[PDB]
Amino acid sequence: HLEEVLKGGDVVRLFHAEQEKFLTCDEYKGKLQVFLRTTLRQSATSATSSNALWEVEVVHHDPCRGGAGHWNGLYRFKHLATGNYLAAEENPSYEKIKYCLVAVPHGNDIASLFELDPTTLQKTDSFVPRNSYVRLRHLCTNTWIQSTNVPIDIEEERPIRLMLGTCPTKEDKEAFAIVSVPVSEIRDLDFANDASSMLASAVEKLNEGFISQNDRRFVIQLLEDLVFFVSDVPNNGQNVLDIMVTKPNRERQKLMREQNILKQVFGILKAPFRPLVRLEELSDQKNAPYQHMFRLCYRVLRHSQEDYRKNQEHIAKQFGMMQSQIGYDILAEDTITALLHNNRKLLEKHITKTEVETFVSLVRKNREPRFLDYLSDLCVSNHIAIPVTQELICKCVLDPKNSDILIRTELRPEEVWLTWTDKNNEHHEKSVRQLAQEARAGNAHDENVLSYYRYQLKLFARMCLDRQYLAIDEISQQLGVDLIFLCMADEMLPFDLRASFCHLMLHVHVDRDPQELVTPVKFARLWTEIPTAITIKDYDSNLNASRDDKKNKFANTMEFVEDYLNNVVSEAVPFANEEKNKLTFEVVSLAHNLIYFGFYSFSELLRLTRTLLGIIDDIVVMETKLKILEILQFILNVRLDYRISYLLSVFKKEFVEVFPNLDRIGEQAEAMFGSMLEVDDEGGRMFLRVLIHLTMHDYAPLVSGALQLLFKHFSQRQEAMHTFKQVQLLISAQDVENYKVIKSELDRLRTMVEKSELWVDSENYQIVKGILERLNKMCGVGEQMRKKQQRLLKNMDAHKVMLDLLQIPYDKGDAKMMEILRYTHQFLQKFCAGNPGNQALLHKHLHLFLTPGLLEAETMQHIFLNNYQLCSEISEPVLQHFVHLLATHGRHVQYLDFLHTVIKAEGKYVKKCQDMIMTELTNAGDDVVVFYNDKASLAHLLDMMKAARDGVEDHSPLMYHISLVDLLAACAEGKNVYTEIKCTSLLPLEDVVSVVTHEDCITEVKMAYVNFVNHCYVDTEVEMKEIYTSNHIWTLFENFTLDMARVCSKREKRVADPTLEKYVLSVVLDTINAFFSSPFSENSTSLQTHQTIVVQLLQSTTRLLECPWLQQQHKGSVEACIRTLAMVAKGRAILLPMDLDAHISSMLSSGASDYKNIIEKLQDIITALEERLKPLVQAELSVLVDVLHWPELLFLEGSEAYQRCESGGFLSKLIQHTKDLMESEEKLCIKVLRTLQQMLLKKTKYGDRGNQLRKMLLQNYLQWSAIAATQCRLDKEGATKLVCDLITSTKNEKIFQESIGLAIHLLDGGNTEIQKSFHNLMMSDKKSERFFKVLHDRMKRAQQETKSTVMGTSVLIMQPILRFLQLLCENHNRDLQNFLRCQNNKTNYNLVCETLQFLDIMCGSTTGGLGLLGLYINEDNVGLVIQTLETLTEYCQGPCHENQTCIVTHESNGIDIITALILNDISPLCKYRMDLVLQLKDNASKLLLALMESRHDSENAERILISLRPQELVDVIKKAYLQEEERENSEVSPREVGHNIYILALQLS
Amino acid sequence: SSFLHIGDIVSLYAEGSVNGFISTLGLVDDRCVVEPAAGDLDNPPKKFRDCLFKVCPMNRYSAQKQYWKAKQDVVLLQKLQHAAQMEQKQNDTENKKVHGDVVKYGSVIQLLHMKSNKYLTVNKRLPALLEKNAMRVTLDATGNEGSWLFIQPFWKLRSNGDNVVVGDKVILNPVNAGQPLHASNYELSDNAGCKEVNSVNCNTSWKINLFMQFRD
């Protein structure tokens, strides 16, 4: 009965690894067939199905005995879901397969016998371990099983069934893995099979026609059991017909779908109506049980499709019957809604005018509010309105024909009266107050009327959702603002009705035009509009004047909201009554919408902030808390804008007073940074307490918002300065005019875009085109004002409008729409022209441009043009998408241009981009990389060049080829050898010369080929350089001389060709200089023909220099080329002409021989303010450290929150949520890590003002032993586990660095408690393998980068890792010292060896250690070398014999480097920074001493003495003793180093 | 059934575009070729001594490479030569000590052609003679860093860290070049019926056939 072996009766899955597929047996066409199922899932092992379960039976003489399996035994496999036995039969056709696997009904024959064959060397034929690969053989035929690609279901779309077959020949790769199956799944399958069999029997009886009472009761009980099983809820007596499930069971839903249980349910629902029962007789008590059965079936259908697209589609396949069985009391409409409320595709596919009319008729007949609720639900899916269904439902409901189903409302002399029509076509009218009073009394009719009215309001609001004007225009007249205000203000009316009225108000009137979101902070301000003095009242008046509306139509609404919030906060417990919570949430949402639309003033916002904080100090509660947090953030932004306005007013006042100060302005700025602008009346205490309480919640969005607000609270000064640094004044009259024009045009364009639906499919197109053209003209030409115009557009936020216009829906075929889209694209391209900020802003919305299109490609090119930051960080998916577009859509030059722009930006090349693009091009194939090398292709290229002799079209195959050649040359220009090899193979030199030397060859192609040769042949790392020792280069030089002669002749004849001039002056000279300035070219100039060509080059180049047409720019290049060529010729001893030699010698001898004032004052003020406020910013940031250290002081003693804070709950929650938010909020995670590091860091001082501010804030808010205690407390809270998880799971360099820093801070001082915690975590948790693997990979990458360089992020990040390891092994922790060397895990990484190898590589290896050590140790890597030496010393000490022996006998011979560090002087660095050299020597001596502490044998001593010569050791000791000049103002004395070296010498002696 | 041990003499049978053993041209030629017509697994070629290779562990060539670079100052060159000789002795000692150890998938090995007594190397800085898009595989007496070969699985039933079983099909991926050995279909002009071996991405697999063991 061992669980580690294969036993009879076990249920397992047979997974074919080569195909990566499970073995399944399914009924395809009325017959069971075995196959391998193909899955589209990324993880092929997760495609588990109930039909893939097989039972293993061991064959023995006794049929009733099983037993553990043996490799030499016989096995049978039974399909657990069907009972059939696996077997083989003759192949009907007989392909390579002789017999095909099938599923026979009986397993008593010998055709179902199989035997296993191990794939490796097992421990004798004792037992068969589970989860072991095996091969299956058919005993009867002596054949081995294998898989084939032949689809069984070939006559269908998407074949998934693959046939298997047995062959006489064994295949080693054909192996099956045995995967275990949970008992839960086994039991679920058994239950499903039993239920399916029983339902099939019941369906058969029903189809026959007669069903007994007992059979019907059994069927009902089975349906109830199925409902409970699918719901996965314990049966505690609750009504089966009404069950709510919090988490659907996907496994059980899939089992129900795949075991043919939903099919049986449909059969049960369909058979009776074919007549045993009629839909018109279901109301009878006799047929009541059938009705209950149908209800149970529909409940099963609803529970089997919750959050499951496949099941939803499978059920929707039978939508006709489900709709035909609607109306009657069966709960079919509820299932229909549950289906077409979560799946948008099915909703639009099925819900149409017929269904809407059916629902309208049903509600007309019955007047049950449930039908209206279903209609409202059908309008919105996933909280997003569906326009098609919304419009259909609106046009059907608001149709005047169907006016008798909606309750009308009116106002009379005021009071509200509701009128309706009863089913008897009788009109009734009654007052709302009377209806509510009678409903509260208990009047069922009045209660039903109120419920119907509430659901009608809900339907209207849902229809008007997402600004559905077609229904808003009709509903607004019926329900005015005054009526809704009266209804919502009335207290006697129920809370649910008041909440419905609030929702209707929100979604009918507030969410309309011209209401729009308003940015609280404006970066552009007009000088003439800055008052001398500004206060809260003046700011509010200015905002009111800016607001277009003069009379506020929502003032009463705002007053009612304020009164309601005051009443809510008056009560001790705000969130007590659930009914009132709905109204509170609706009021809060309305207030949020009004605030974001800009209807409040500064004072009103402050009062609302105080009220909301008082209210603050369950899903509805969380939502209203989120709304309150958003309101608080908006109000804080408004306060920041007010502070900026105050600073502007102060600056203007000072400037006007002094020009019809710095200390005064600084004091005035400091004054506001405290009284009337406070968030709360307690000086921020209430705000901080609320933030902490919200952070203590388990709701992730609320916690994130609270943390963000807490971090922003202590950065007001820094944020204020940052925002003030981006303020534009627009003083000039031209600037003011441009600002006005831009504002007007943007407003008109935004209104037109908002009213898009009425003109997308007319003067609107002309207006849009004119606006776009005017904006493009306004953008301007010329860098003098281009930056100003771009900054003004950025401040005016035109980019958002342009992005919305691009996102505007449209139909293909509209030339005018295409024209306006092109204009918008051109405007965006011009906006992102030389502005990194604009480029980043556009890149932040990159997903829009990741679609096929030449305009999109051009926009991407402009965005990424000349931006190294984005070019180096470009993502692989973008390049993959571009390559896929090139491969599929076609060969367009736009993609190549974008690739070249990405490769080259700001001069510097991007190695990552080059390599990635080259690899993608190589892998794509010949469909994107086209080269003309064959005879026919060369002829076609010649024909194309001849046709393009006059010029080359912008879009042409010749242009594409030229762009491809340039791209390949740029890629090969990097530092990759395989790229150069691939380029040379793609374009052989013979083809290059044949194309170039041809008389018909365009200058563009000539230049491209010459550049390709220069960057792929002349300069390469290939040992076998084919460019030299060949006549191709000489022929190319002859062609270059001919081109030079042609250029000279054209210049003489006044036929100058700019293209030819550029080619000859750019590529020809560069290639000549590169060829003749290399050592490999010394032997090239040997033959007489080569000498003659050299003379021809000399005469041509000297004639070119003599000709005066050359510009001054190329004079230097020409002179350099001439000098190099003359030097080569003289070295080769060429008989130059007398006059030519004289001229060359002469040339060599010659070569050898008041807006400006306002801006300036503003900049000076900004600089002074930043310089003065930086210490205060530091102090305010530090105060957060104490706030987090002592959070319980903010609360009151004895409270639950106080106890939780004192028990360390705050820090525990923060740490736990940091890991959760790591993936989402990387910036927030980094901020949290920095805060923890600051809290763990030692306290410091800032100055008099800083200390005053710090003490004042501490008084207002909170009314080495310490470091060790803080480290222990953080470890208890769980900082060590946090850092370990971050290190082992993070992909962000900043996050990794912050985690390393936090670990270093925790381990600082060699804290044994934290060391033990780390050791326990590493030895217990299974992530230690990943941790050590990532550390080893980072160290290896750093070593490789150092070797390649012999600087860099990888090299720099090594020092923190070494410091972390040193602190981990500090205080002679032998356990950790041995763990770092060898780990008990399966795979061990030797960090000591890795560190020693890194040290040896960075010290120059053998060449550096033999006496050239000074050429590798610079002033930057000295610290890293010292840290490495300290880490090695810490490893060795303790002492650790294993580590000492490993370092001494390591194959890298780092002991030689260590000894050289002492016996050699770093000449470059000794005369600059001698103290660093002394520290290096001291560290090396200490390491050598530590290597021999507890050693009695002479092995280590002899090994060290092999490199340490005693004479040199004595000489260096004496030199160190004599050296005393450096001792002046030296931290380390040379005498101490000499004494340590003398001690080492004594030990070695 | 047996595992692959360091020091065993084995033969490599290519099963890809062209099927055949790995052979080397006579004389001092340093080109590795595959001759499908020479023979097969059931009928090995008559000259079944040019297709035998020995498995060896990784060797260190840092000092040797530095000495070669310096040679291509007298005291420095002499000390570099001494260091290279010491490194060679250390490599020989390491080979002797690691002799008989089992080879695991994902490990680095070297293939010593016994008849020529030369290690099989792949040069990433030299294109192949015929297939210009593939690098060059040759034989070197002393050897270099190009002799290193990751022994990677070809079947999906084998995983890294598992012992290599005789008769398995594997992939020999150079550590530096990073592209598996490929038995190209190109035919050498000098010798008819022979196919070149180069380094380029492909689906080629090498079946390992045991000829003799270290204990034998």
Ligand SMILES: O=P(O)(O)O[C@@H]1[C@H](O)[C@H](O)[C@@H](OP(=O)(O)O)[C@H](OP(=O)(O)O)[C@H]1O
């Ligand atoms: O994530 P989605 O959109 O639901 O799609 C799932 C998955 O991508 C496949 O469509 C299907 O797996 P197969 O390729 O194995 O059919 C699976 O069905 P399953 O529930 O039967 O695994 C789906 O649920």
